[PDB]
Structures are given as C-alpha cells and as structure tokens.
Amino acid sequence: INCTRPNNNTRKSIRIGPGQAFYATGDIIGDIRQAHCNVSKATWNETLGKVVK
Amino acid sequence: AVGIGAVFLGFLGAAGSTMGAASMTLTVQARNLLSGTVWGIKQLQARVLAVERYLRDQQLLGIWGCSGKLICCTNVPWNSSWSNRNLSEIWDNMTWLQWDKEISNYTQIIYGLLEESQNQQEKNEQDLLALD
C-alpha cells in the first residue's frame, strides 16, 4: 500500500513565550491535492478471494 | 572447527521427557531461576519478586533438612492414599507435568509432614549426640 500526501507543506516557527516554539502550516507551494492511498486491485481481489474461501 | 557447536542442556525443553530422564536437567533450571522512574521501578520489583520466590523455596528446602541438595531423601513414608500407582510406570512413562497435575491436591500436607519429621529428627539427633 502506497500512502501519499502530495502537498508541499511548509513549517513556520512562532515564539509563544520563553523557549516555547509552535510549528504551524504555512503557505503551500504549488498545487494542492488530496492525500490518497493506492493498492493493487488484482492482489487485493486475490486476497479477498482467499479470505472468502 | 569440524562442525562442533554447543549441545548444552538448556531450558525446560526436556520437560516432555520422562521423570528420571528429566531429572538430569534440574540444576540448569535452578540456575536459570536467577537469570540476569516508572519502568525501572517495575522491572526492579519483578527482579525482587523473583528473588523472594527463590529465597522462599530455599528456606522451604532448608526447613525440611535438604538445603544445598537438588535431591534429598526424607523419613516421611509415602502413603498410598495420594496416588498408589507403582514405581515402574512413574519414572519411565509419566512426565513431570502430569505428576504435578495429579499430586497438586495434597502438596501442603506433604510439606507439613516433611517439616514435622525434620524437626523431630533434629531434636532426636541433638539428644542422641548430647548423650555421647
């Protein structure tokens, strides 16, 4: 299974207080796409068939 | 270096063998009995619990006059009420686990009888030696 988030996220540091750092999601570079996971259809089908048996 | 290895008598792997055959590997398990701030305390507690268990077993062995000996004969007669059987089928056919399962009921009375016999023997020996 291949799980991917293709968004080019950026980390931004904010000083909340003394030695307190907060990491926030800054502007995304480029296109924005939904994170998705891929599996092999044939392999999943054969595994489901074995499970069914 | 001709293909040799260790071939050492290890853990309870011999438990499935017979009574007498498994009596070979008592000492290795006896030695294994002492194999060796929220998690270190728990592991230390486990170690201390194992230590108390082994020390209590040693104290029980010493109370029956069998300290320092893996095998120690005693003067308590073997009443046939517990399990009659016979010697031949015990030490050559039955395993240790089956024997423990069979005799698990009357262990405490055996311990008490061994205690009383050892105390009486100690007093009799003291009196006899003081006589000489």
Binding site: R15, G17, P18, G19 | -
Partner: protein, 53 residues
Amino acid sequence: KEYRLINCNTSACTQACPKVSFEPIPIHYCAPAGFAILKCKDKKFNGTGPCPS
C-alpha cells in the same frame, strides 16, 4: 530605550529559594556492598599508572 532579560528568547528562569544555601559542604562517596574503593597513598603519583602504596 527598551531592554529585555537576556534569557527571554531562550527559556524562563527559576528564581532560587532564598532559604536554600549555595555554600558547598563536604561530601563522601561510599561504594555499596560487594564493591570496594581503592585510594592511592603515593605522594608522587602523577594521576595515572601503577601505585605501590
């Protein structure tokens, strides 16, 4: 003219309790049971090597 504590961008300090004394006191280190502490009595010992006393 505006100034800030030097530590404000690093961490927050913990003021020491006034009743607590910073004066050093003699201390001894003792080995537990089963261990021993060896002292080299040689007056010309240079910190390493053999010691006969």
